[PDB]
Design a protein around this ligand. Structure first.
Ligand SMILES: [Cl-]
Ligand SMILES: [Mg+2]
Lengths: 195, 231, 241, 235, 240, 250, 111, 243, 244
């Protein structure tokens, strides 16, 4: 899969993810949701090799949902990211590694703080105010570096995200058929249906 | 008594009681007769029904085109041992393009049964087999006991009241051995032999099971109206 | 009372299956003796061929483990040969791995450690044998090391094993109490064998023909067993003084 | 103690003979094979009136052309049914055809004596395997924990078996209709059942070539029970 | 590995280890299940022999297998945890492969299957546990209540009890529960469940736990005071 | 074949007793007396070389064994069980410590590893417990000098001074009267010889007594010079002569 | 490097009539530009009124025909001497072939 | 007591009662013998004709190992076959690694260690056979007899089964009367006589004589069965001696 | 074969009890009394060493109170050797969780893991169970201060105050009498020592016969400190509370 962006603002995390699924010559789908809800206040967007992406995302989802039931408790975004990193770090020295890059956007209900974690397929984890995977960062980061403030509202975050998507639509050779945008806050996960 | 708890224990007189108890299961089983000439070998088996609604338990199993046996005792054990014979007959044909000698088939059954009598956890086979076959040395009849003892005979019988049929064959020995190139007369001698082991009941059309293998005769089982000719 | 059937502790803190294995040791009714010279270690053992149908050359309780190590066994021949084959395998493997000949006392300890395992593990029975290992070790010199079903082993100046071990032991004890040395002060192994046979005759109070004895001799860099004619020469020398 | 695979002095496997005693304590199951189809009927025997009786599943589909009724420790049957279903589907995958009722029964009976010190004990349940194939037509088999299977024109297993089997002895003939068989199973179940037979404590099923294996609705069985009562009052 | 056949048949055709596993259930604290018209209630006895107990952290008797299914039990507490874990794993495994949460019947059939397996597997003893599995099938408003036992047999119940003095509370439910008209509301269903336990419990204090499961993953555990109000109202009507 | 004893041979009796451990302790009680005394500047472990025969060379039988350069062990009970425990103790000191941390284990942790091996023989399938009690004396940089007892159960306790086996009850009473927290190593050896004389019937000399100390570093016993930090082993087995010298000042 | 495969040439032809079927094949076996045999039978009677030929790598061909003939024999044993229908034989051969999906038989099979 | 219920359990005597019970099965078996001649060995066995229905010369009891070793046994026939099957594996693996056919003393220990191994554990039963075996190797002729305990020795003559006392007495006479040795053809004749004499302990049923031999001169050091004229000559000699 | 000698450690009695579990509990009933008392501002662990000697080196000795991590400690009652096997397993399980989730293991998750191991030895394997009862004193940021106990059955329960080992009947009655919910650590220290002093089979309770530990938020600000009391510190608290 292609472009996955993330931006952590004042009180929420916003994950933008392309809708295009291309198999070589033809664009098979233009409405693909490249994200899974791991827990009520933790969302994970993913991009990488065909099949491995969904297989990994669903496997993590199943494990976090199992923990949630066993302990009757939601793991902190930090705890979920640490679990995901270990699975990818384990994966890279396997017979056939998961070729999957993920952004984990979560709202920590204990600390009342949004948290964005960027983890590549090697198991390289970093906590960031804004992150991306593949070539998405090359086009967008120069805009985010300029405009980003830690005290930004969700609406300002979406406006800065639109400027990022516009720059991608201008200078990227590939048509990624726009993005599905999702917000993670204290009230949980909701999808922006107009973008 | 104290030495019949498992197959791994000798008695003070050097007996294996679990093997002797397995041998007893054969005596409870329905009578089956084996006899051969120089050209043909015949199995005759009295099949046993549960009641009048039930079918008559099949006694004869085909192992190859040139070999097969009849059983007396635990039928599931006969299925295990016959399946093993089928495989060994098959292995010989595929690997060596060679029909498995009846004598060698006996040696293989003996060795398979023996392992169950010397090892803890396992149990002896609870069935006796009469193996007939025609190979490169003519017609053959074998008697298999789950003790491991396999014996090559002209004729024999195993099961309940088998002694009656075994005495008859011991008298008729000189006659039935000479029935060469006459399958019908050899079966007649086998049907007359198993008749010496009957009490109260007689040989009906769904009661009697006959098999024959010979010089130009593949191992074929006769049941139903096919054996009405011999009643 | 299943504490008498397998190797677990009785209320007294005893292993009865070990104690009964010691009793199996004397089933052959054979007495062995081992003594040390200056340059050699000699082991003698009674040879009894009761059946005339037996090939007497094949009746032996002395084993050539390695070139350097010899082993006499007190106990039944099946367990003796079980122990013999293992000792040979252990001695060969040692040389391959560590690049020098397995010492007598190290093999004794190894076979004793194996014997110990049988006294602790239930599925394995003890071997009903006492193993007397002899060599001229390249470091320690003349060496006698004896193993038993308990897994006990120790070095000896001299030793005796069998039904009449005590009579032989006391006879040897009395000699070493006089001489006040840990060995037979003799140059040739031939005379150390003559000493061994003489002191067994004195202890048991029985005379021996060439076919009644079995002799093993350890020298530097080889252990070997004497033929009936080599023993006969030994018996002649004893009788002529 | 003593081996699980031990023979008695009479030449019988103790554990197999003891499992047969457990099957005698089981609820009654009856099968009747006709030229129009095979009928399978069971006593449900609910331990309490609060137990929803339609959740008692003692008649089970193996394939479209093979049904199965059980009596004894019914929990033990689940792994036997699973194997039977797998065997039936697996053969269809390998040979693009339905499996012979005898071949299916033989496959189930191969599990029976796979116990020792494999599973730790024999199965504590007997099965009536009823079906149809092109070769041998409508068939009813009795699969025991001994690994032996007999083909029957009619068979009763469970607590009321010997009383029911004596009744089946008199009643069965080679010219029975499917409707006659249905009433006959209902008649003999009602005879041997402790509680009074209705559509909630008893269940009917059949296997026909056309429609395959079908478990009867409580409404359909209720009508056949009412048809039985009237024809018994008729003389 | 340890292969010893512990669960075997006796001459009278009984598996004593399975029957002795039921005797462990008989000892266990009383659990009761009552399904209304649009809810299921799981009542559970807490023996008051243990006070100075921390009720915040002490393992609760009713366990969530998924967001829509619950499992209560009577018998060995340690044994129950192994069945609950296996069930919770199978619940997530079903969601992952079928892309649909387990039916209450399927989850029951699985747990019952595990219990059965332990009655003819070598070197293992049966579970000293009977379970009440309650909930609602996905996108279904029909209440579901199932019972399992060490033998591995399972069945659906309009109302059922397990554990010590379960004979007495089943006696109560059999005369008090009408099938044609089940407890229409949550109140009526909880009341009938508390009433059934009060036949056996002793004091209606911290000895009764009540968990109400409603359709669409709506599960809540009643507090001491909420249950205490039911206990109060029942005995004030009884004084007549 | 196969080890078909995959079940515990040590089980709880109705009274709550583990029979095979109690019987193992009975076997230890029958064993020859061994003792240990801890001084301010060293530890001493001693036992009687009960020679089975006067023909036997009792020097070849080592009752007091080096486990590491700074740790020594003595026993009471079944000699063979002790010998295989010393072999396992020496190896586990390398495999589970030295090959990881590049240094020998501290006394308490090696004791813990030996204890674990003896515990497993008490629970594992188809084995009896070890019929020995061990007295392990040792020194390490951060814990200093220490003395530990290990029982067939796998239970271990640290001691200032103690005795195990035949005359342990009488010996422990003797040590209680003599022991103080100001003893020098020579004073502890003197008390060790006095205590051990009571439980010995026959000959009492350097040839019938086995005695070792955990004391000062022995650079003479290191076998190489040139590395200042390597100063040699603290474990030293006293010679037949060294014992006899201290039996004149007895 | 060792090449486990070879080409033994040959050509086979199967034609289905209204109430009959023919399976024909040349009797020439070759490697490269050499003739191995002028008469090496390639089409085989497998019993149950089924004829079969596996053309390409003769070793893999003989192996497959042999294993199918064996499958017919065991079908008789397991299913009360029932005749193996051509459609059943076909599905059986698919499983024999796909069984070595990752080390295939270099043969084009016609029955 | 209870020491005799389990294999590999030492009685207070120091005895393995289960092995001693295995010997009772051997003593119950038919008579089998072995005679060591000048340049080889001769094996003979008593085959009890239970019934007329037994096909003569078909139920062969003596077994060959490799091409140069003969094996005969008394007691549980299946146990004997199991031991020979192991012997053939031992002889094959030896030849595979060392090229030369297994020497008889080497082969004797291979059987010996295997039979002894079945007295070490309660999970296996001891062998219910005494096995008389041997043949010709590079060091000449060798005859051995192996007991359930795993005990074996070299023999001049060997006998086991029900008529072993009778046989042994006859073997002892041959050893005394022939110190220079016995010829291969003489040993076949004497073997026939001894089985006929030892048949007095099994006199109820009539029997069938079976003889085999390995001889450097007569069989080129290979194991062969005594057949046709040479067998009839030995039967005639035997029948003449009993009358 | 081997079956003859098998005790069958994992079977039910006719009454539906686990023989070996019941007999293991009988074993533990003779072990030194261990008490845990949970207060609002910390937890106390008090335990009695069994009939000691004057020559036992007490300052380097540990038979009762063990550290699982920086937040969780256990008091032992039963076979010390059996406990150390489980303790080492628990310590690893705590570090495995910390490595995976980069957060300290919640107390109940550790307790359940150890309890599930104990359960296994009662259902399969044919081995004897662990003759050990634990008192788990721990803190996490979900439930705060928590007391638990596990026994050889593998059953665990939460407590405000609890005893294991000898004279638990007498001990639990004395705790149930004098415990209150608003109690503080200093008060809980006094109760624990007073309970042991009355239930002890010894003539008098002295410092050399006691192991003592506290888990306090009495750690400078928003963190938790474990304190394994030294022999001199146990002697001081015995004089302070007025027992010696
Ligand atoms: Cl070793
Ligand atoms: Mg043992």
């Amino acid at each position: 899969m292609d472009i996955i962006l993330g931006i952590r603002v004042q009180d929420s995390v916003i994950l933008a993810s392309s809708k295009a699924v291309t198999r070589g010559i033809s664009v098979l789908k233009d409405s693909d949701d490249k994200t899974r809800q791991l827990s009520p206040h933790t969302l994970m967007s993913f991009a990488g090799e065909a099949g491995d992406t969904v297989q990994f995302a669903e496997y993590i989802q199943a494990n976090i949902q199992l923990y949630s039931i066993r302990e009757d408790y939601e793991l902190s975004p930090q705890a979920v990211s640490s679990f995901v990193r270990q699975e990818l770090a384990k994966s890279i020295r396997s017979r056939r590694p998961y070729q999957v890059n993920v952004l984990i956007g979560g709202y920590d209900k204990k600390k009342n703080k949004p948290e964005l974690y960027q983890i590549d397929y090697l198991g390289t984890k970093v906590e960031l105010p804004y992150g991306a995977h593949g070539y998405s960062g090359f086009y967008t980061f120069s805009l985010l570096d300029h405009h980003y403030r830690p005290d930004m509202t969700t609406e300002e975050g979406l406006d800065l995200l639109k400027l990022c998507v516009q720059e991608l639509e201008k200078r990227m050779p590939m048509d990624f058929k726009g993005v599905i945008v999702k917000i993670v806050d204290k009230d949980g996960i909701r999808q922006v249906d107009d973008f | 008594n104290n030495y019949d708890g498992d197959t791994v224990t000798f008695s003070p007189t050097g007996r294996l009681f679990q093997v002797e108890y397995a041998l007893e299961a054969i005596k409870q089983g329905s009578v089956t007769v084996g006899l051969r000439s120089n050209t043909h070998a015949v199995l005759v088996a009295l099949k046993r029904n549960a009641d009048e609604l039930s079918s008559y338990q099949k006694k004869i199993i085909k192992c190859d085109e040139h070999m097969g046996l009849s059983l007396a005792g635990l039928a599931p054990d006969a299925r295990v041992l016959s399946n093993y014979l089928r495989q060994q007959c098959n292995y010989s044909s595929l690997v060596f393009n060679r029909k498995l000698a009846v004598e060698r088939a006996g040696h293989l059954l003996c060795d398979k049964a023996q392992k169950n009598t010397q090892s803890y956890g396992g149990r002896p086979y609870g069935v006796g087999l009469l193996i007939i076959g025609y190979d490169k040395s003519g017609a053959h009849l074998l008697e298999f006991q789950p003790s491991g003892n396999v014996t090559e005979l002209y004729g024999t019988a195993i099961g309940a009241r088998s002694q009656g049929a075994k005495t008859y064959l011991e008298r008729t020995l000189d006659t039935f051995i000479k029935i060469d190139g006459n399958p019908d007369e050899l079966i007649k001698a086998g049907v007359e032999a198993i008749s010496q082991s009957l009490r109260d009941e007689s040989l009906t059309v769904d009661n009697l099971s006959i098999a024959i293998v010979g010089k130009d005769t593949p191992f074929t089982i006769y049941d139903g109206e096919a054996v009405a000719k011999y009643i | 009372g299943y504490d008498r059937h397998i190797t677990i502790f009785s209320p007294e803190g005893r292993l009865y299956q070990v104690e009964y294995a010691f009793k199996a040791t004397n089933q052959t009714n054979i007495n062995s003796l081992a003594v040390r010279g200056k340059d050699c270690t000699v082991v003698i053992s009674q040879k009894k061929v009761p059946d005339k149908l037996l090939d007497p050359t094949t009746v032996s309780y002395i084993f050539c483990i390695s070139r350097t190590i010899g082993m006499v066994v007190n106990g039944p021949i099946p367990d003796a040969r079980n122990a013999a084959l293992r000792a040979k395998a252990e001695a060969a493997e040692f040389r391959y791995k560590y690049g020098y000949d397995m010492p007598c006392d190290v093999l004794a300890k190894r076979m004793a450690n194996l014997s110990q395992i049988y006294t602790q593990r239930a599925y394995m029975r003890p071997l009903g044998v006492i193993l007397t290992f002899v060599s001229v070790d390249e470091e320690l010199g003349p060496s006698i090391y004896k193993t038993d079903p308990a897994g006990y082993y120790v070095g000896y100046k001299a030793t005796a094993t069998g039904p009449k071990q005590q009579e032989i032991t006391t006879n040897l004890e009395n000699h070493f109490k006089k001489s006040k040395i840990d060995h037979i002060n003799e140059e040739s192994w031939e005379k150390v064998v003559e000493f061994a046979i003489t002191h067994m005759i004195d202890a048991l109070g029985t005379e021996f023909s060439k076919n009644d004895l079995e002799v093993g001799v350890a020298t530097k860099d080889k252990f070997f067993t004497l033929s009936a004619e080599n023993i006969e020469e030994r018996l002649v020398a004893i009788a002529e003084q | 103690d003593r081996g699980v695979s031990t023979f008695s002095p009479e030449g019988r496997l103790f554990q197999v003979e003891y499992s047969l005693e457990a099957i005698k304590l089981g609820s009654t199951a009856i099968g009747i094979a006709t030229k129009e189809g095979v009928v399978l009927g069971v006593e449900k025997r609910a331990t309490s009136p609060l137990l929803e009786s339609d959740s008692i599943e003692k008649i089970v589909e193996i394939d479209r052309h093979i049904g199965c009724a059980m009596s004894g420790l019914t929990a033990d049957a689940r792994s036997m049914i699973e194997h039977a279903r797998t065997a039936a589907v697996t053969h269809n995958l390998y040979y693009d055809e339905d499996i012979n009722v005898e071949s299916l029964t033989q496959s189930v009976c191969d599990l029976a004596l796979r116990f020792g010190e494999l599973m730790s004990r024999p199965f504590g349940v007997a099965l009536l395997i009823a079906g149809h194939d092109a070769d041998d037509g409508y068939q009813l088999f009795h699969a025991e924990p001994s690994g032996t299977f007999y083909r029957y024109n009619a068979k009763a297993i469970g607590s009321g078996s010997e009383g029911a089997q004596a009744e089946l002895l008199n009643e069965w003939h080679s010219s029975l209709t499917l409707k006659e068989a249905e009433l006959l199973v209902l008649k003999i179940l009602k005879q041997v059942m402790e509680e009074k037979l209705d559509e909630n404590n008893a269940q009917l099923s059949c296997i026909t070539k056309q429609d395959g294996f079908k478990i009867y609705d409580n409404e359909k069985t209720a009508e056949l029970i009412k048809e039985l009562k009237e024809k018994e009052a008729a003389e | 590995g340890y292969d010893r056949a512990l669960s075997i048949f006796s001459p009278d055709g009984h598996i004593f280890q399975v029957e002795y596993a039921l005797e462990a259930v008989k000892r266990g604290t009383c659990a009761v299940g009552v399904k209304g018209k649009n809810c299921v209630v799981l009542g559970c006895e807490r023996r008051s022999t243990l006070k100075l107990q921390d009720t915040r952290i002490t393992p609760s008797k009713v366990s969530k297998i998924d967001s829509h299914v619950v499992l209560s039990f009577s018998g060995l507490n340690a044994d129950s945890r192994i069945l609950i874990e296996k069930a919770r794993v199978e619940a997530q495994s079903h969601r992952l492969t079928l892309e649909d949460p387990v039916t209450v019947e399927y989850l029951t059939r699985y747990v019952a299957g595990v219990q059965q397996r332990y009655t003819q597997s070598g070197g293992v003893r049966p579970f000293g546990v009977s379970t009440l599995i309650a909930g609602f099938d996905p996108r279904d408003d029909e209440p579901k209540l199932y019972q399992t036992e060490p033998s591995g047999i399972y069945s659906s119940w309009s109302a059922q009890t397990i554990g010590r003095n379960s004979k007495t509370v089943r006696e109560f439910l059999e005369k008090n529960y009408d099938r044609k008209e089940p407890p229409a509301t949550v109140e009526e269903c909880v009341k009938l469940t508390v009433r059934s336990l009060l036949e056996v419990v002793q004091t209606g204090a911290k000895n009764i736990e009540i968990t109400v499961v409603k359709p669409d993953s709506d599960i809540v555990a009643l507090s001491s005071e909420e249950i205490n109000q039911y206990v109060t109202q029942i005995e004030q009507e009884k004084q007549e | 074949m196969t080890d078909r004893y995959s079940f515990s041979l040590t089980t709880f009796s109705p009274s709550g007793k583990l029979g095979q451990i109690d019987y193992a302790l009975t076997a230890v009680k029958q064993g020859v007396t061994s003792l240990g005394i801890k001084a301010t500047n060293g530890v001493v472990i001693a036992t009687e070389k009960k020679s089975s025969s006067p023909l036997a060379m009792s020097e070849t039988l080592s009752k007091v064994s080096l486990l590491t350069p700074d740790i020594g062990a003595v026993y009471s009970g079944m000699g063979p069980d002790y010998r295989v425990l010393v072999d396992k103790s020496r190896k586990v000191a390398h495999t589970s410590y030295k090959r990881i941390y590049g240094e020998y284990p501290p006394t308490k942790l090696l004791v813990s590893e030996v204890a674990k091996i003896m515990q497993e023989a008490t629970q594992s399938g188809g084995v009896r417990p070890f019929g020995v009690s061990l007295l392990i004396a040792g020194h390490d940089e951060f814990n200093g000098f220490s003395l530990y007892q290990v029982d067939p159960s796998g239970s271990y306790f640290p001691w200032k001074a103690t005795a195990i086996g035949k005359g342990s009850v009488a010996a422990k009473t003797f040590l209680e009267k003599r022991w103080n927290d100001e003893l020098e190593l020579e004073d502890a050896i003197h008390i060790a010889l006095l205590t051990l004389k009571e439980s010995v019937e026959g000959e009492f000399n350097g040839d019938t007594i086995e005695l070792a100390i955990i004391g000062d570093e022995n650079p003479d016993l290191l076998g190489y010079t040139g590395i200042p930090t390597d100063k040699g082993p603290r474990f030293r087995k006293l010679t037949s002569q060294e014992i006899n010298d201290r039996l004149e000042a007895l | 490097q060792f090449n486990p495969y070879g080409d033994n040439g040959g050509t086979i032809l199967g034609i289905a009539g209204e109430d009959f079927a023919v399976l024909a094949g040349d009797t020439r076996n070759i490697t490269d530009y050499s003739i191995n045999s002028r008469y090496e039978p390639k089409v085989f009677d497998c019993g149950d009124n089924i004829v079969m030929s596996a053309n390409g790598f003769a070793a893999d061909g003989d192996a497959l025909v042999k294993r199918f003939k064996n499958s017919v024999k065991w079908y008789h044993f397991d299913h009360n001497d029932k005749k193996l229908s051509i459609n059943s034989a076909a599905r059986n051969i698919q499983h024999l072939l796909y069984g070595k999906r990752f080390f295939p038989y270099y043969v084009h099979t016609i029955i | 007591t209870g020491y005799d219920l389990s294999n590999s359990v030492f009685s207070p005597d120091g005895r393995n009662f289960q092995v001693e019970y295995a010997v009772k099965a051997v003593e119950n078996g038919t008579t089998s013998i072995g005679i060591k001649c000048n340049d080889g060995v001769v094996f003979a066995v008593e085959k009890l004709i239970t019934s007329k229905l037994l096909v003569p010369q078909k139920n062969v009891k003596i077994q060959v190992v490799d091409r140069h070793i003969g094996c005969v046994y008394s007691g549980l026939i299946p146990d004997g076959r199991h031991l020979v099957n192991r012997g053939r594996e031992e002889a094959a693996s030896f030849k595979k690694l060392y090229k030369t056919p297994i020497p008889i003393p080497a082969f004797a220990d291979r059987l010996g260690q295997y039979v002894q191994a079945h007295t070490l554990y309660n999970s296996v039963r001891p062998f219910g056979v005494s096995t008389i075996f041997g043949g010709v190797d590079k060091n000449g002729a060798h005859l051995y007899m192996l007991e359930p305990s795993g005990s074996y020795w070299g023999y001049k003559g060997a006998a086991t089964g029900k008529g072993r006392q009778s046989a042994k007495a006859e073997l002892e006479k041959l050893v005394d009367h022939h110190p220079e040795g016995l010829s291969a053809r003489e040993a076949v004749k004497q073997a026939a006589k001894i089985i006929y004499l030892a048949h007095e302990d099994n006199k109820e049923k009539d029997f069938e004589l079976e003889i085999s031999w390995c001889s450097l001169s007569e069989t080129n050091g290979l194991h062969k069965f005594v057949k046709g004229d040479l067998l009839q000559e030995a039967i005639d000699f035997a029948q003449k001696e009993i009358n | 074969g081997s079956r003859r000698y098998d005790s069958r450690t994992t079977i039910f009695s006719p009454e539906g009890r686990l023989y070996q579990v019941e007999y293991a509990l009988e074993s533990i009933s003779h072990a030194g009394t261990a008490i845990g008392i949970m207060a609002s501002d910390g937890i106390v662990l008090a335990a009695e060493r069994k009939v000691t000697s004057t020559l036992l080196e007490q300052d380097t000795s540990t038979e009762k109170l063990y550290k699982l991590n920086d937040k969780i400690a256990v008091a032992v009652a039963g076979l010390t050797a059996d406990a150390e096997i489980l303790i080492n397993t628990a310590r690893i399980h705590a570090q495995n969780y910390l490595k995976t989730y980069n957060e300290d293991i919640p107390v109940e998750i550790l307790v359940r893991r150890l309890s599930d191991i104990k359960q296994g030895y009662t259902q399969h394997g044919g081995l004897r169970p662990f003759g050990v009862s634990f008192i788990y004193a721990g803190y996490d940021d979900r439930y705060g201060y928590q007391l638990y106990t596990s026994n050889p059955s593998g059953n665990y329960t939460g407590w405000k105050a609890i005893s294991v080992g000898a004279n638990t009947s007498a001990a639990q009655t004395l705790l149930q009498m004098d415990y209150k919910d608003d109690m503080k650590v200093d008060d809980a220290i006094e109760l624990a020592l007073k309970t042991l002093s009355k239930t002890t089979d010894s003539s008098a309770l002295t410092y050399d016969r006691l192991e003592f530990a506290t888990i306090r938020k009495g750690a400078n600000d928003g963190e938790v400190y474990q304190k394994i009391f030294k022999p001199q510190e146990i002697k001081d608290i015995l004089v302070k509370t007025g027992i010696t």
